[PDB]
Amino acid sequence: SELLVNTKSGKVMGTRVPVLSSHISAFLGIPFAEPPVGNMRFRRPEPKKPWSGVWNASTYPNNCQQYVDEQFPGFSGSEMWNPNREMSEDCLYLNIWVPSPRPKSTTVMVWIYGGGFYSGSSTLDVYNGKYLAYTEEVVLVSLSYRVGAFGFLALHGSQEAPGNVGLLDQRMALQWVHDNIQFFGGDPKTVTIFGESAGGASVGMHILSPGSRDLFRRAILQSGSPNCPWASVSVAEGRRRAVELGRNLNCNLNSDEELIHCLREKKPQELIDVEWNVLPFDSIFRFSFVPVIDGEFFPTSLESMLNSGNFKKTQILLGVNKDEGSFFLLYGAPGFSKDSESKISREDFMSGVKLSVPHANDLGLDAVTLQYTDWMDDNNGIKNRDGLDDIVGDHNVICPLMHFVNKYTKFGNGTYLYFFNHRASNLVWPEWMGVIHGYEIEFVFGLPLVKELNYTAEEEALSRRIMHYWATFAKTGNPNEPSKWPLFTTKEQKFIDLNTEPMKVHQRLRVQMCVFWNQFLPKLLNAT
Amino acid sequence: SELLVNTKSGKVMGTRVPVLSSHISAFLGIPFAEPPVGNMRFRRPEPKKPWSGVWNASTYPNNCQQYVDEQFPGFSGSEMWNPNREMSEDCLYLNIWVPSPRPKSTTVMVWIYGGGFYSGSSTLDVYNGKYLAYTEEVVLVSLSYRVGAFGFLALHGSQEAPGNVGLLDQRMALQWVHDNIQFFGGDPKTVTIFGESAGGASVGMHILSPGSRDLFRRAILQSGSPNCPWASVSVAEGRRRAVELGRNLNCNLNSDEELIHCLREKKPQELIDVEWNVLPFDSIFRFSFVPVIDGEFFPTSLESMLNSGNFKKTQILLGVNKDEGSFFLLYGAPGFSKDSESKISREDFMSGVKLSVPHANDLGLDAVTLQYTDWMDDNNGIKNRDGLDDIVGDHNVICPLMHFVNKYTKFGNGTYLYFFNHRASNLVWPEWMGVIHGYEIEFVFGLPLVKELNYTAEEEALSRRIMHYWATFAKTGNPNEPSKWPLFTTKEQKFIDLNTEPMKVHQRLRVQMCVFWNQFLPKLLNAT
């Protein structure tokens, strides 16, 4: 039977799923690690012990324990990211969508979800892989990994909570795909990892980590890069946050062993209830437990690895969306609200910049404010609102990604850069938010091809070309089918817009602002 | 006789001069101080001892000793600023153009020439006052003052070379006008001092100096303000330059008395031959001997005087030209030449910024470069050339003037701001220079009304409205004849363009760049 597959870990039984008036096979909830529960909480993952009998893979697995968003109870724009399955620390599973009839050796894509390293699920409706698998004839995999303290609490030097274990979860799933995807019809030598935001940062982290490089062929990064300012911390800051977490739960802090034992007896929700109290600054776009520059998973600083070409050399396809900052300003900056046009006063602008660049001294905050203010019209509420969206987006997503692409391209084997700027016709978020962080995903997973979802015919067509660009790149290392998406080069720096209008090629994506964020401001903060 | 005038210092005999097919009286070369020669070199000026008999005032006086421009021998654009009379340390004289028949009590305007405080003459063809006196029926005075080391060598603490003596020369001429202009038909209560560049800085310095305020009624400043970065130095820097001058002439440096005695035995040209060797940095737009913040002529720092309203409160009319930096870049920055279009390489741009902001550290030079570079097109030769013109102009002329007008307006009694951007049809300087520092003067003095000079009929008309705006302001404190030039206010900050097109009103003259030069960069250099 097409729904039965024997892997090196055991037999697995999938289920048939309807898709656009046809059907494909799905193997949901395949375990790739031992449940990281009890004394295994905070530990590196262990491979799943092989099982006899048939694993029932007909239903989605539990989602990892995480902070649930209650900012807009019941609002769909918000609920679409929340766990849609019961949460459990027993959550290390992966999902596979396989074309029917079963391929022999086809292109494989493995999705890594985002969620600021503190949330995320492989089971969300926007990540349903049946459309992409079906439409492009690829074997589509979505993995999962521990988030929040469970995935990233780091007490460097300790073997019990070393940090980065969520990244090791991703790697273990990638090892499992490398070892077993051939049985599902996938070519393990043509595995493309792709992910958005913390998932895109994760993809870049596997490109950098010597221990992950050999497990995949090429990479796609959507609105995230490894060097994002929110994506990692030093071992000293990670240690400081772990100790502050213990301090919030009245833990014995005399030793790492004491702290970890205490943290392991707490129920999951108790850690989540105080997770946000350990940030060092009042800030937006900063998350508590994230990857640590540890000397193991990351051998040296990310910048020296990038500078010296110490990373996997292959082809990459990546990009950003037009209004990367709006989501975070809505959730945490003064003056923004979901149901108003959010015109921002001069004062709220200044407190927004302080929140956006938490690590900056006063001269630094002045430089940002000067750079983003139109001084002939400084009380313009729309301009201040949009200026803050650019500050947040440029500092946290865009300029770090432009820095990564320029460093990468010098040693890589092919780069394709995009700028996604289509505002979905059925977007439920207010107009002032624009093209929001995360909202290109639905186009990548082909949701616009299902009628009940209400997209325009042109949005369906944009989704189909994005899916074909992504799958053709996964297959060949070039999104173009032999109107061209040009290669991004060190000299030319070309990229394309991704929207419903005829393709336009541009150059040096937000260079002006990124020279400020990547070269000037760090020099300024260093001298002062 | 209309050409005979008896003043408190003695009788003076003028001469009749033809002007636009009519005639007026001129009293040229009237002495207002004792010749500052011999042991009087570097000393405060002494009032001219009254004389019996009739002073022959039919011809122009000698020009003060100064560095003569040989950068373009015989070229008219350059020669028009050079002394056109024999140079002599005996040069403290003033000139008066008087309408015919002689007025009883009319509006008086006193012109103070520029020349970077190191050069300048009251006798230049572009300063011929007959056209303005004639056309607007005003008594026009042009004074003179010592420049270079002779006017500004400063050994603070010494009474022999205290500094600022050139400013005291101007004040003495203003005292003479106050005491005697009534005899020539001028109303001493309606005296407007006006001047360009170092002459405009000088005008602002008399607005600030308690000892000059009472001598005039209102003021006009053209492309200069007291707080310009090149217009003054501390007493320590002035002292250091005087000692370096002596060191260049092998002077005994054991004491102020020794240094001054040595400097007083040198012929004028010997001091001028080494004048430029005392600048502290390789720089452009910096001059050796200039006003000193001494605690006497200037009681405290210029900024605290401006901040506290410690200055003459009256009406002011002032402005700048479009391309204030081009003249200085031509003369001293790499890549610029008089006979090429002067497209500037990225490299020459960077060495131009280093030359333009001599006092800045490397972070400071980076901030300027970032602010003026179009990073999507950084090798564009025209853009780099124009960017440098703006850097020089904004840092040295425009932003200091915008800072002065905003501080002044808070306490003043009426401000009128202009932006002169007409490129003369007969300009002999290359096109790339644009609307050059100093080139609005010919319009202010009405040269476009003389046919042989070859201006267009519209340029003649622009000159006539500028002359009428200036004289009406001198007369009434408002350039408008009862299409309006609006008052510049703290709230609105309006100004008008001055050119051959219908008047346009704008707001916040170069605010974006001036917030960088007046607020950001000084804070940056202070923190680093």
Ligand SMILES: COc1ccc2c3c1O[C@H]1C[C@@H](O)C=C[C@@]31CCN(C)C2
């Ligand atoms: C830095 O990236 C993020 C930080 C926090 C959140 C998200 C992030 O990326 C967004 C889109 C997708 O990756 C998943 C979660 C996001 C949308 C839902 N919530 C509530 C929070």
Ligand SMILES: COc1ccc2c3c1O[C@H]1C[C@@H](O)C=C[C@@]31CCN(C)C2
């Ligand atoms: C800072 O202002 C100046 C510094 C140097 C010079 C001039 C300046 O202003 C210019 C126009 C007018 O004021 C007189 C001299 C200038 C034109 C002639 N030369 C050679 C030099």
Ligand SMILES: *[C@@H]1O[C@H](CO)[C@@H](O)[C@H](O)[C@H]1NC(C)=O
């Ligand atoms: C697999 O699990 C689902 C739901 O838990 C169930 O309906 C289905 O029949 C199961 N298959 C087997 C044979 O276990």
Ligand SMILES: *[C@@H]1O[C@H](CO)[C@@H](O)[C@H](O)[C@H]1NC(C)=O
């Ligand atoms: C990628 O590598 C192959 C050889 O290993 C080379 O021929 C090709 O030009 C490279 N492509 C790019 C864009 O560097």
Ligand SMILES: *[C@@H]1O[C@H](CO)[C@@H](O)[C@H](O)[C@H]1NC(C)=O
């Ligand atoms: C004034 O001086 C000029 C030239 O020096 C001379 O031609 C003129 O006649 C003089 N007038 C008298 C009477 O001194």
Ligand SMILES: *[C@@H]1O[C@H](CO)[C@@H](O)[C@H](O)[C@H]1NC(C)=O
């Ligand atoms: C100038 O001063 C007079 C009174 O001294 C006042 O009435 C007038 O409004 C003032 N003008 C301005 C523009 O301040």
Ligand SMILES: [Mg+2]
């Ligand atoms: Mg935006």
Ligand SMILES: [Mg+2]
């Ligand atoms: Mg210019």
